[PDB]
Design a protein around this ligand. Structure first.
Ligand SMILES: [Mg+2]
Ligand SMILES: [Mg+2]
Ligand SMILES: [Mg+2]
Ligand SMILES: [Mg+2]
Ligand SMILES: [Mg+2]
Ligand SMILES: [Mg+2]
Ligand SMILES: [Mg+2]
Ligand SMILES: [Mg+2]
Ligand SMILES: [Mg+2]
Ligand SMILES: [Mg+2]
Ligand SMILES: [Mg+2]
Ligand SMILES: [Mg+2]
Ligand SMILES: [Mg+2]
Ligand SMILES: [Mg+2]
Ligand SMILES: [Mg+2]
Ligand SMILES: [Mg+2]
Ligand SMILES: [Mg+2]
Ligand SMILES: [Mg+2]
Ligand SMILES: [Mg+2]
Ligand SMILES: [Mg+2]
Ligand SMILES: [Mg+2]
Ligand SMILES: [Mg+2]
Ligand SMILES: [Mg+2]
Ligand SMILES: [Mg+2]
Ligand SMILES: [Mg+2]
Ligand SMILES: [Mg+2]
Ligand SMILES: [Mg+2]
Ligand SMILES: [Mg+2]
Ligand SMILES: [Mg+2]
Ligand SMILES: [Mg+2]
Ligand SMILES: [Mg+2]
Ligand SMILES: [Mg+2]
Ligand SMILES: [Mg+2]
Ligand SMILES: [Mg+2]
Ligand SMILES: [Mg+2]
Ligand SMILES: [Mg+2]
Ligand SMILES: [Mg+2]
Ligand SMILES: [Mg+2]
Ligand SMILES: [Mg+2]
Ligand SMILES: [Mg+2]
Ligand SMILES: [Mg+2]
Ligand SMILES: [Mg+2]
Ligand SMILES: [Mg+2]
Ligand SMILES: [Mg+2]
Ligand SMILES: [Mg+2]
Ligand SMILES: [Mg+2]
Ligand SMILES: [Mg+2]
Ligand SMILES: [Mg+2]
Ligand SMILES: [Mg+2]
Ligand SMILES: [Mg+2]
Ligand SMILES: [Mg+2]
Ligand SMILES: [Mg+2]
Ligand SMILES: [Mg+2]
Ligand SMILES: [Mg+2]
Ligand SMILES: [Mg+2]
Ligand SMILES: [Mg+2]
Ligand SMILES: [Mg+2]
Ligand SMILES: [Mg+2]
Ligand SMILES: [Mg+2]
Ligand SMILES: [Mg+2]
Ligand SMILES: [Mg+2]
Ligand SMILES: [Mg+2]
Ligand SMILES: [Mg+2]
Lengths: 213, 122, 112, 54, 116
RNA sequence: CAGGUGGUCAGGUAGAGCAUACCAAGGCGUACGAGAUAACUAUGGUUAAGGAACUCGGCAAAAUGCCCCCGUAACUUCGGG
RNA sequence: AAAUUCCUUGUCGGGUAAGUUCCGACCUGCACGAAUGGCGUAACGACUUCUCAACUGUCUCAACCAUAGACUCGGCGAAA
RNA sequence: CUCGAUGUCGGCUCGUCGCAUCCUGGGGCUGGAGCAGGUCCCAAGGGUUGGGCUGUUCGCCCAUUAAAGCGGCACGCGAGCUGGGUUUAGAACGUCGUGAGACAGUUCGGUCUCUAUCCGCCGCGCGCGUCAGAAACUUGAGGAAACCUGUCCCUAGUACGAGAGGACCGGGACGGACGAACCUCUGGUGCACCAGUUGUCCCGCCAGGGGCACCGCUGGAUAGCCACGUUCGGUCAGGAUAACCGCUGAAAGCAUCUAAGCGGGAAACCUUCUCCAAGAUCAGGUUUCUCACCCACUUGGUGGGAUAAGGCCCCCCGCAGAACACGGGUUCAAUAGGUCAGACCUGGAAGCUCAGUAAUGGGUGUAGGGAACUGGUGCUAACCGGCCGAAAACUU
């Protein structure tokens, strides 16, 4: 009751619909997937399904990971993730060895696209958090982009935890909710997803079906 | 895009030649005014002997903008000046006729009378 | 070639003439006024191309009633009925933004 | 800012023992009938007569 | 070529045009130049594009080399000896071998040389 | 040791000029280097639309700039402005 | 109502969409005044104060780029 | 308490908390017809605008808004910034004093020092632990983030009302503000891109180019980074409740929401959605791989040596990056460079020829030059290799 697929962001183009409006889409190669494992509550305590994606040469996969595919009877893929289901109904429509292509989604379905955001490096506080900074003139001495104050005074004699300071920004799991599927393309294994998708062009992307719609 | 302290040429014959923005009506702390947005303005320059005088607080709708506007089909419109029409409180122009071209964004903001008086709606 | 040329390929259009920056162009644009679907003519000077295939735009500039207007349509857009070249131009730039500060006799383009 | 107090013996040695040289790894090279040891990044230059073994 | 992602060689970016041109005059005159390792990674896609003008060898390719190299005696050996030497090789005209780092600043050194 | 020190000589092209620009004769590359796209600070550069709304205050920046030719107000001690 | 006015943002006119500052008067001068000069005054001011045109990262609201440091490696190596 | 120093008002930047609630949410009474109100009770989840004048705080005013809350934290915050006011030395006016001078009376002028040792906070590694050595995918104890709201239409000119006016509850569309990811468009930037052009020197000279003048200036500009641009979010449904409205019903033959027992009930609380997370020392789970030797001794859960699975270092690099880490690749190779062809940016090269007295113009030719994005190509460098790394048992 919650379909999912793994894929690769291929970039953004634009396309038009029947009302002659322009729709900025993000082309995702929702490629062919294969199951390799089924999590059951009597064995594992939860209910999920694995999914394997990506063409890899069979010499680049080491011997512990290879034998996990030999028990499933599947040639080794590159990526391997899980699709979290609810407390039932996993082994009623998924079998070990099944082929999940891109047409499990319809047109006009709403999806949740999660991924990994682009890296921004060690970033300051006017970029990581939107601090305003000080002025650029009127006497301001070397504090144009600095945070300013960070606490009170002798009560309390500390900085509170979670105080927004500089640091590294990005490379986080980011889920974008309720994006519209414009056109499924089973000929090429390509979903045209309306809007923006987290990641760099080439990164892994999990496309699940939305629940908020 | 027009905010507070912007100056706009006036695109009708009420007597005013240049108004200055005060608020952008539409909500708390709304920052910009595109085409079809209502401006409370003061009148900074006028023609001698006209209907309105210098220093009057008017309402006005923006009809021309130098900054581009993304229409919902991918096309844009761009003008060489910022223009407005001083309006009555029932969305009717105070003057009798409108100078220069206007934008077609005035159609879905129910400004039917400014469209019929404009020389060219784009 | 690009990676996404199997997605833009069915959306491309033929019967679009070969116009350069500096030409004079009619653009027939479909306009909905209620439920009427009329067709409005835009005659001006093409000043710009920003290429890419399905993502390519052009920009026309006319002088309407003492006030200059620029439109920036996409090429291969379905709200354009047809484009008709009126006059070829003899320019030296590719962006022609110097016409944003000229009026009258001085905003004229030659005839080849 | 200035240091408030002097650091104890246990706190100066814990930091100072981390200023340590990281050693390189040597590999075996036989040129001109003599065996030597160079790092692996200079493996090609040992075989072309560009490394002076002193 | 692919520009420098980061600070330029020798300080300014008007100085990197002079460093990469002087190293090319010396690489084409002697055939083997010892220098620092970052200044030789940066010479390899810059010198191999001057040999490609020598493999073509028209007047328009010789005027293009004279934009960068100021020394006419090494332009002659580029268009009469080096260029026709590489007529049957599809790129990769140079080679970087790594030398021992130099004393005094531990600057990692490397040689850059033509293939034969 | 980025500060201070009196006089003398003083080239070419552009230029009103001993300003400034690029050069001659003649000097020098001046004494830690080599790398690397972090924040942040300095020193510079550009900026859509708006144009003092910033601010104690147009502070800082931006703007004006040269030669020839027309033209030029109140006020005034008749010179000026 | 002042480089002088405490009460005080006095009151009235002007300027501004809005003016404790500014210009004009009024006189209820806490506490003006004739060489410790009184009242004016063209020119002049790196002086104080207010308005306006032109212009701009001063700001709405920030973005990016080069360089010197910061950061890494090798040498020398302090200080409160 | 501090005089062998605890820096003062306001503003900027960044905050956190209380509720004595300004808005939004739930209610009782009303001298509540309706619409708007008054008063009291519950409620802190989020939100609470920009300007004029003043050093100001405060306050008046302008234009809005769902509303423009009140307070604590050294009247939060100067080893974070400002220095206009107060509160040094200069000077002046008024007033006081014979004078020197003085004035919560005024007025112009007036240096804001510090390389972070410790805890604290924000990030990132190294070490060991988790009873063999490894690799992959994981459950979630417990936390972080987020939480705002308007206008118009329908129901309906209906209920209500003499009229004027004008709804509750339900259904829909379109916005403001704020956060996130993103680069297709719009826009910004562009220091090895293309073109025009001034001064000057140089390449022997002409023709063609370069060095330097802020990237000399100027017109453009792909990639990256970006916002002014794009798309999306704060939803729906449960649980236990606050004020308050009840049902059944005694003590008290009646009555009462309560003493036994059971309900309805809010942006607060808990689940649901997003993220972190087994150093959760109770150190988890499901799996696959290796699953094996040798020597010395005081024979010990003993020291060394050599391996397996697997990893690290070196090497070629990255849109990953301060260093480290992380990710891809290593000839069974397209990992970077070159090279070939596209895309894209610039806009018509040089040479030759024709037209003109010449400056310049036409032709050969969507020319030439060129970086990031895409695909072929085994030409250069990813090598002729070093360092780590696997098990006492016993009880039921
Ligand atoms: Mg980066
Ligand atoms: Mg700022
Ligand atoms: Mg300083
Ligand atoms: Mg500064
Ligand atoms: Mg402090
Ligand atoms: Mg193009
Ligand atoms: Mg760059
Ligand atoms: Mg340096
Ligand atoms: Mg230069
Ligand atoms: Mg000296
Ligand atoms: Mg001279
Ligand atoms: Mg000079
Ligand atoms: Mg010079
Ligand atoms: Mg010296
Ligand atoms: Mg930098
Ligand atoms: Mg600007
Ligand atoms: Mg502009
Ligand atoms: Mg202006
Ligand atoms: Mg002004
Ligand atoms: Mg102001
Ligand atoms: Mg501010
Ligand atoms: Mg202000
Ligand atoms: Mg100034
Ligand atoms: Mg300036
Ligand atoms: Mg004057
Ligand atoms: Mg007064
Ligand atoms: Mg006065
Ligand atoms: Mg007298
Ligand atoms: Mg006297
Ligand atoms: Mg006097
Ligand atoms: Mg003087
Ligand atoms: Mg060092
Ligand atoms: Mg003390
Ligand atoms: Mg009430
Ligand atoms: Mg309460
Ligand atoms: Mg609050
Ligand atoms: Mg809550
Ligand atoms: Mg507070
Ligand atoms: Mg306070
Ligand atoms: Mg304080
Ligand atoms: Mg302060
Ligand atoms: Mg004094
Ligand atoms: Mg006296
Ligand atoms: Mg003062
Ligand atoms: Mg100073
Ligand atoms: Mg510091
Ligand atoms: Mg939990
Ligand atoms: Mg804990
Ligand atoms: Mg962001
Ligand atoms: Mg792009
Ligand atoms: Mg653009
Ligand atoms: Mg060039
Ligand atoms: Mg010449
Ligand atoms: Mg020179
Ligand atoms: Mg771009
Ligand atoms: Mg509820
Ligand atoms: Mg997780
Ligand atoms: Mg474990
Ligand atoms: Mg690796
Ligand atoms: Mg030609
Ligand atoms: Mg001739
Ligand atoms: Mg010619
Ligand atoms: Mg190419």
């Amino acid at each position: 009751a919650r379909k999912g697929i793994l894929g690769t962001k291929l970039g953004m183009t634009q396309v038009f619909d029947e009302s002659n409006r322009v729709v900025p889409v993000t082309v995702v190669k929702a490629g062919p997937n294969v199951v390799t494992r089924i999590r059951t509550p009597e064995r594992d305590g939860y209910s999920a399904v694995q999914l394997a994606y990506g063409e890899i040469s069979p010499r680049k996969v080491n011997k512990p990971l290879t034998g996990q595919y030999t028990a499933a009877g599947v040639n080794p893929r590159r990526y391997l993730a899980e699709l979290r289901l609810d407390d039932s109904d996993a082994a009623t429509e998924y079998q070990v060895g099944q082929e999940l292509t891109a047409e499990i989604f319809a047109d006009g379905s709403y999806v949740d696209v999660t991924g990994t955001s682009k890296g921004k490096g060690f970033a300051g506080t006017m970029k990581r958090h939107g601090f305003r900074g000080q002025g650029a003139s009127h006497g301001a001495q070397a504090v144009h982009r600095r945070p300013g104050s960070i606490g009170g005074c002798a009560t309390p004699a500390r900085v509170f935890k979670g105080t927004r300071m500089a640091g590294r920004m990005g490379n986080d799991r980011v889920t974008v909710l309720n994006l519209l599927v414009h056109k499924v393309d089973a000929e090429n294994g390509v979903l045209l997803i309306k809007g923006a998708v987290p990641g760099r062009t080439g990164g892994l992307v999990m496309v699940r079906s939305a629940i908020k719609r | 895009v027009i905010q507070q302290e912007s100056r706009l040429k006036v695109a009708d014959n009420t007597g005013a030649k240049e108004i200055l923005c005060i608020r952008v009506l539409g909500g708390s702390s709304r920052r910009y005014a595109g085409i079809g947005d209502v401006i409370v303005a003061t009148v900074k320059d006028a023609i001698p002997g006209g209907n309105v005088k210098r220093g009057d607080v008017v309402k006005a709708v923006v009809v021309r903008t130098v900054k581009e506007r993304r229409r919902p089909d991918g096309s844009y419109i761009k003008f060489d000046e910022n223009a407005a029409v001083i309006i009555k409180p029932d969305n009717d122009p105070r003057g009798t006729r409108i100078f220069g071209p206007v934008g077609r964004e005035l159609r879905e903001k129910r400004f039917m009378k400014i469209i019929s008086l404009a020389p060219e709606v784009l | 070639m690009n990676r996404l040329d199997f997605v833009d390929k069915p959306s491309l259009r033929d019967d679009i003439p070969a116009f350069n920056p500096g030409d004079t162009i009619n653009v027939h644009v479909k306009v909905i006024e209620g439920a009427k679907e009329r067709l409005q003519v835009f005659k001006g000077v093409v000043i710009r191309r920003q290429g890419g295939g399905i993502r390519e735009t052009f920009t026309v500039r006319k002088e309407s009633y003492g006030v200059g207007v620029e439109r920036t349509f996409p090429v291969h857009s379905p709200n354009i009925d047809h484009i008709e070249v009126v006059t070829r131009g003899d320019v030296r730039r590719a962006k022609l933004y110097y016409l944003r500060e000229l009026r009258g006799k001085k905003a004229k383009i030659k005839e080849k | 800012a200035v240091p408030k107090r002097r650091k104890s013996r246990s706190n100066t040695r814990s930091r100072r023992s981390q200023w340590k040289a990281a050693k390189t790894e040597l590999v075996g090279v036989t040129v001109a009938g003599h065996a030597h040891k160079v790092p692996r990044r200079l493996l090609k230059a040992a075989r072309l007569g560009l490394i002076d073994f002193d | 070529p692919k520009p420098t992602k980061g600070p330029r060689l020798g300080g300014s970016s008007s100085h990197q045009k002079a460093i990469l041109a002087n190293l090319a005059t010396s690489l084409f005159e002697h055939g083997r130049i010892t220098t620092t390792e970052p200044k030789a990674r940066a010479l390899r896609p810059y010198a191999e594009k001057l040999i490609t003008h020598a493999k073509k060898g028209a007047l328009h390719n010789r005027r293009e080399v004279l934009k960068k190299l100021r020394d006419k005696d090494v332009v002659h050996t580029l268009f009469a000896e080096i260029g026709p030497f590489f007529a049957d090789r599809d790129g990769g005209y140079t080679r970087i071998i790594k030398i021992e780092a130099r004393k005094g600043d531990n600057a990692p050194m490397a040689v850059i040389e033509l293939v034969r």
